[PDB]
From a paper:
Note that we solved the crystal structure of the truncated GVE2 HNHE from N39 to G130. The initial 38 residues (M1-R38) could not be solved because of the disordered electron density, indicating the N-terminal region of the protein is very flexible. Like other endonucleases, a zinc ion exists in the center of the structure of GVE2 HNHE and is coordinated by Cys76 (in the short loop linking helix α2 and α3), Cys79 (in the helix α3), Cys114 (in the short loop linking the helix α4 and β2), and Cys117 (in the helix α4 at the end of the C-terminal domain). It resembles the Zn2+-bound structure of Gme HNHE11, suggesting that the Zn-finger domain in HNH endonuclease is conserved. Firstly, GVE2 HNHE possesses an extra α-helix (α3: residues 85–92) at the C-terminus, which is absent in Gme HNHE. However, no additional metal ion was observed in the HNH motif of GVE2 HNHE. Here, we found that GVE2 HNHE and the Zn ion were co-crystalized, supporting the importance of the Zn ion for DNA nicking. There is no significant structural change for the two structures of GVE2 HNHE with Mn2+ and Zn2+, however, the C-terminus of GVE2 HNHE shifts by a distance of approximately 1.3 Å upon binding of Mn2+.
Author numbering: 39 to 130
The structure:
């Protein structure tokens, strides 16, 4: 297919994913496993409530890992922001 169309379809698929029953359930499973604590803060010896579950390898980078618990971490906002910058260095 046309490259820009493939990009469109990937982005539409990713948008739909966050509405999915599978994501809703898996998000909850990760937060529960993590005891609602930010996993980056915990590794840095800090206690912070998580507010988001993030893909380690981003969803748009590897669709196949979208529901893998070892590809998901509960994060606070500050750690999500830090990770976003880190990921720009890796993937643009
Ligand atoms: Zn944190």
């Amino acid at each position: 297919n046309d490259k820009e169309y493939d990009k469109h379809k990937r982005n539409q698929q990713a948008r739909a994913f966050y509405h999915s029953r599978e994501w809703e359930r898996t998000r909850l499973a990760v937060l529960a496993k993590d005891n609602y604590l930010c996993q980056h803060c915990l590794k840095e010896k800090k206690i912070t409530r998580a507010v988001i579950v993030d893909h380690i390898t981003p969803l748009l980078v590897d669709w196949s890992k979208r529901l893998d618990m070892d590809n998901l971490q509960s994060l606070c906002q500050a750690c999500h922001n830090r990770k976003t910058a880190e990921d720009k260095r890796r993937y643009g």
